[PDB]
Symmetry: D2
């Protein structure tokens, strides 16, 4: 279990060391922490979300040695990189007007990873 | 009275009142979001209440705007992820930037009726 | 070969292979969930991929079953599948609000086959 | 009379009803540091901050003409507190626990909800 830390604006790519298949990476104690426009702090455990991204390649034919967070925006780590229900989901931040109020909010992602 | 609208991929989608009055009074009906996936298949979803909820969100604003714009944090124009169809284009299904890049050429359209009450 | 199914409100919904084979080979097409809301309006959503995912979930099971059943358990109801903005947890958040949906209709139609 | 934050705790099988003391409008209740905790069928622990979920439930009454003096957690099943009462994405959501056969594996999982609540006050 090696630790990792990413800050707002980082490109987050989890890569195996020997460029073996990323489907073998597992995660532990992963916390995503962000602020809302009012300045309050929020965090959420995203360990299973990450583990499911790795398991996503479990039955692939050309499995890669990496995966990268970001969605259709290929955007770097930001306050919406993971969902905390009731806080930063689609129903709470539903428009571009609202989402713009969030553009300077902080975001961080820490945790442990290993190959199994 | 009900007036149609249509948007396609790459459009900025802004709903505005003709009276520069509160957008909170705009209502929607038979709104359909349609998109393709990377295999070329077709998917659609009724998004009427999503849009109605967006307008209703200004019901209590002290200085309510006369418009609202679709987009999320990307400030992205209409794309295949502008509305969620569960099991197809949601975060669990499209979870990494690698998988999402396979969608960048998928088409998307949004059509429906809007009026002011 | 594709084959149609229909279920109505209150049905237990169990998709099963005919040959006691592994339910992970079932696939679905043109699956539509339909329900009414408290005001009586009709709502539909395509749940084909949701149902395919429920079958594909069993693909890596050591002793896979010949069936799966919808629910979390309650028979088919207006909340069996989510239509965002209409019947999700954000919109129907409390038991009190959910009570107004007690008599809402619900139906599920589609096609299934084994691959 | 004390007006600040006051703690609550519910556990599995409890009917969870939040209520004002004077039968006034539940739209004025607010929440802070609310945590939903549950186990999974493997016995691992999971927790999630549900403070805004609870605040949105109270705020959802703020426009009713005749608001109630309480609301109850539950959903269509009118169920008491259980491992599925709040969603932790990727652990207990519809995509992760998609069938009755899978959900049945969670029947004996424990769950608790704790937090702070206060009531907004208006004056003349």
């Amino acid at each position: 279990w090696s630790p990792f830390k990413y800050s707002k604006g980082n490109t987050v790519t989890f890569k195996t060391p020997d460029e073996s298949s990323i489907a073998y990476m597992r995660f532990r104690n992963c916390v995503f922490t962000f602020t809302d426009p009012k300045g309050s702090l929020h965090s959420i455990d995203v360990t299973e979300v990450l583990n499911n991204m790795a398991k996503g390649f479990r039955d692939a034919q050309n499995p890669p040695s990496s995966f990268t967070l970001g969605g259709h925006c290929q955007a770097p780590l930001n306050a919406f990189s993971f969902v905390l229900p009731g806080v930063n989901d689609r129903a709470t931040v539903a428009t571009a007007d609202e989402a713009k109020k969030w553009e300077n909010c902080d975001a961080t992602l820490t945790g442990l990873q290993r190959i199994i």
